[PDB]
Amino acid sequence: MKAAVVEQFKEPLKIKEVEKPTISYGEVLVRIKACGVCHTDLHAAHGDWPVKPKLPLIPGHEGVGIVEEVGPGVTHLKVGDRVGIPWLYSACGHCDYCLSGQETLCEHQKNAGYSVDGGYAEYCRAAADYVVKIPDNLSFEEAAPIFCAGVTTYKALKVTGAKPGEWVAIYGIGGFGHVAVQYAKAMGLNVVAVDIGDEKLELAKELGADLVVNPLKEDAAKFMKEKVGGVHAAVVTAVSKPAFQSAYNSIRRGGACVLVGLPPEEMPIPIFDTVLNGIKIIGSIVGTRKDLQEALQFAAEGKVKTIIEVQPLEKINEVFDRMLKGQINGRVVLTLE
Amino acid sequence: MKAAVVEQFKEPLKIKEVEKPTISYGEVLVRIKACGVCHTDLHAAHGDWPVKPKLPLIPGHEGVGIVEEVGPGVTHLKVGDRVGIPWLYSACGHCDYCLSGQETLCEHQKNAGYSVDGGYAEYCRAAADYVVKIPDNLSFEEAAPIFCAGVTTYKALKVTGAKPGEWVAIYGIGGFGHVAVQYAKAMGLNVVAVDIGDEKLELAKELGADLVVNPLKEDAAKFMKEKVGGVHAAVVTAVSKPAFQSAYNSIRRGGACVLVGLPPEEMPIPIFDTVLNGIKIIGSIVGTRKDLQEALQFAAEGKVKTIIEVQPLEKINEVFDRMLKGQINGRVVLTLE
Amino acid sequence: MKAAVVEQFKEPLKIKEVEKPTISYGEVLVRIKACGVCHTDLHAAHGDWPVKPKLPLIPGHEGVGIVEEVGPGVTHLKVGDRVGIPWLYSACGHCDYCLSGQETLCEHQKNAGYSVDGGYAEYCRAAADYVVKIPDNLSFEEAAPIFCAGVTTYKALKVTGAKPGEWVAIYGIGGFGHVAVQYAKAMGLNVVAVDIGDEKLELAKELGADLVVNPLKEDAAKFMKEKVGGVHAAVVTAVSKPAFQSAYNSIRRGGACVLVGLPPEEMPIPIFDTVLNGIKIIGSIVGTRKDLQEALQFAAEGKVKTIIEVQPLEKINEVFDRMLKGQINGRVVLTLE
Amino acid sequence: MKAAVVEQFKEPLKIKEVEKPTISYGEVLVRIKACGVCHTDLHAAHGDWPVKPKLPLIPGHEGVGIVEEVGPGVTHLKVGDRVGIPWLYSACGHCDYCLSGQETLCEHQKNAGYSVDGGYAEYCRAAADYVVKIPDNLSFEEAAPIFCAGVTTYKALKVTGAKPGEWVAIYGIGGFGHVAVQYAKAMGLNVVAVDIGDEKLELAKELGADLVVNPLKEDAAKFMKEKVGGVHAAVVTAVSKPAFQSAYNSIRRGGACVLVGLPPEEMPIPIFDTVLNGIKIIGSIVGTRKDLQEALQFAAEGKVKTIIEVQPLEKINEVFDRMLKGQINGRVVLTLE
Ligand SMILES: [Zn+2]
């Protein structure tokens, strides 16, 4: 089978033939139809995160395809089921986190396409209990990104705890923001899109966003004041010092600021105002199998559609390239068939 | 009527005769029997907060006493009712915050002994709807610190989400700290007291604290760890960057780190861990009229007692010196009879 | 001023001149532009409920209109503010219910057009803290059913716990039913409309409802099995024994069955299944001042429109006649100008 | 090995030597040290519940003992661990219920000592992922009842949603009731014990209960009114027509009635009053693995202790004799060593 191996950090990826994995108990082998690409893959190749991966490594925590074989004793999935292998490759199922509904946080979790081989290959071995069925009415192309940025974003929106009728501010109408907006709408919310790019605010608006501001150009929080009483919550999709300061100020008292990005730097946050106004700052990323079942169904119903550009496995290095100069419109799925 | 009065900032106050206030509609006239003192009264005195008070000012948002006359309109209180006047002097009662359970954040709120004359005097004019009744079984001197330290700490504990069985770390065993521990135990929780004085830790243990550490010499997070598996939550009662930092690291994944102090500067949270481990950082101060009633009732049942020292009004300045010098263990309550 | 007046029970009401009421401290005087009618106004008329009203009485708790004078004390309202007088005429605003978010349950509540004169007259005296403002963008005739049907149904939907994506069954597509469906949709929900008239089911479908059943020629519970896997919840808007048993059986395990009707008799629940499957049976009526504000805002944004028929005061008895005969489709709103 | 086999319904159980079971993948073999008996077991003998068991059957869903062998692939349990096999023998792990945290409700669940052999034998095959470790500081004797009576009751208490400070009424200080009281105390609550026998009301008070009342002698609901203000919730441990009516009436408006009984009959509830007071009626039984770990730990800390009478396997039929007569005080554990 063919794959895209990261042999050495920061080095271009090899598109070589590799040994096609074997499967023992409780596993499935999956023939990969597509696999979405996001910044996380790139950081895996560059090797520049506290915990770094084991080389060589096939990336892809957004791989989706067909269950080709089912190892001894797996019963809840049949050959030929349409299926996806999300970031949470496996978790213990036994610790407290797992028994709460926070398997996403399990200390002994293995991560797809980072600590084990993932979706940048023709085939992928997966943990049967931990793969998720893609519903019929939803294409492989479309589903792939629902596995990262869909759930990440959807779950974030559940986490804001904003309820139908209330207002969320989405910060950054890129690959997260652009799908956030649709989820927030499908979730009963009124949206404020916030972005430096006048064309992204245009997109967000076709996408359902109720109000746009461009935080240049004028004052974003003073506009959300202003206007809508200040938003109930904000989702930050490109967390940076000024992105956060904005979200923070625009949120009404008691509001939540949910941070979904993964930047290297430490913040800071005002303590006085946070205490005086009981502001909530919360990290969230990916989400539960159930979160994903739920996020996938919204897409399955037309309520959210991702802006994809298809590419083949071999153009991967060009796509990281591109990604690193920040020239990617939403998300890049890789075709394998 | 005599009062402690703030004439100029950073200047000794003047115990002196002033005008005994007149009452209008929905107001009551309270004869102060005792008033609590905390750092907040002092920051008023020094006038060093972003929104400074207007001089002259009688401080005290921890005053309790007897209702001497009802204003017209008020029908829910009678002459002789033992009552208190919280930091939350008044709220509009109509804004959205007021119709959630969030009067504490009302944009129109007035603050006792800050934006209006408070409890450092023989009498106080108060908004009837906003006074909280003291249970019969609890004395004036005991009740008074429950009006700030009690509610603030109790509320903080509720906001943590922590359920009977779970673990909290209380950071700093001072005025808030030592009452925080008692509320924690009364609420089903298991407690790790954390402080730099081994004396405070000894006091914590007396108050029910399950486990102590001091933090210089190890290392709280890792003790805590090691050990209870990391606490479900932390309440930080004196926020220095090192306290908040340890608080942050001791908290297990999914955990809530409730901030309760009001220091001037900003403190930096590491975005990457905050997102990855689903951390919550939350500000909280004081509480609802109902929060307070609940806070008060635990004390009535003898499940939390404050460490009070009683000084007469005339000694207020002497007490601010010992405050600046950091010498007050527990809480000082002013007497007025 | 003129009014429809209940002089003796079960007798036709007399349209006649009466005293235009005078206002004291904290009240306002509203000039009624329109007032909704519901079964509850008729149960007052017939005096057949456990706690009967004192005669003579002006019914109507869906009265909306212009504020014509502000009582002394009231500061949050001005003359010409378009306002409504909900069933919750007033509460003590001090008890525990009132300081949760449960004013709806206050032991001292007074009810509009039941314990005190209400909306069936040119003027009405109301408790200022308790009138709810009507959005600018919404007319009197539309607003008025939102003051009973809207909140009761919207709240009811919230109380079910059902989150965006999940399924509810709205049982009975009448005055409540047809507004329930619209709220349900605006709230992110998927809706199974259930009624005996195939006509109502067509109406439901126009209103946004995803699936209908009759039951009553199919099995409804089994339809819902089947289908959607059983609904997360049911709001039962006309509680007859059969509707309840059907509702109860259609709900999936863990489910909530929210009751909203007020029939005289008792309905039996199967203790053994209720425990085994963790079912919840919950009563809900009307809602908070804040509940209504939210209910009202959905209508302002055009997401729920009530089907109204307008009649002048003089035609009231003709409308109670059509009410008993069960002929009123949707809601009737009385005009007074 | 020897077991207590239900060969024919209602017929006395045969203590007979039977085939020691074998274990495959994902399973464990357990040597039973003890096994609690309760009403459920008896209803498996008598065969008188909607879904009846397959015969022969070895009852016991409170069996606790030692992991004698681990089947291929299990990794969390190790040979020699102390362990228990609760009512929920197994569930699918993949349906919605399972992924909410409602495995208790899974349509595909097997039940121990009912739909498969459980604890009334010397040995018991079990689903590795579904057994729970008994904490070290807790005897097999003490733990056995925590596996059914403990959780059912602990969980019930979480479900009431009552919080530290509030009041719950435990109805029936028998087998469940007597441990409920301790749990509610441990959970921060204030308890009202309600029982016909002064016997039990004395026991309850030793066990921590704040107030008692015999529904003889006098009005239970009016006493609770009265007094405490009406309880926030009631757990009903012996559901009967008049028990339930009492709990119902004593609950304050907004309160919850958690039913924990398994009586054969239907049971009227008032609809009018339920709606008007937003009352909640909720079935609950057993609970999650995590619910059970938590319930076990309270006992481990000496916060709840079960009143046990030990008996060997042979007197099992003597125990059902007394039980059907209702002369058992607390719970009967069977010894197997
Ligand atoms: Zn990704």
Ligand SMILES: [Zn+2]
């Ligand atoms: Zn785990």
Ligand SMILES: [Zn+2]
């Ligand atoms: Zn204070």
Ligand SMILES: [Zn+2]
């Ligand atoms: Zn306000």
Ligand SMILES: [Zn+2]
């Ligand atoms: Zn009505």
Ligand SMILES: [Zn+2]
């Ligand atoms: Zn009240």
Ligand SMILES: [Zn+2]
């Ligand atoms: Zn049992």
Ligand SMILES: [Zn+2]
């Ligand atoms: Zn299941």
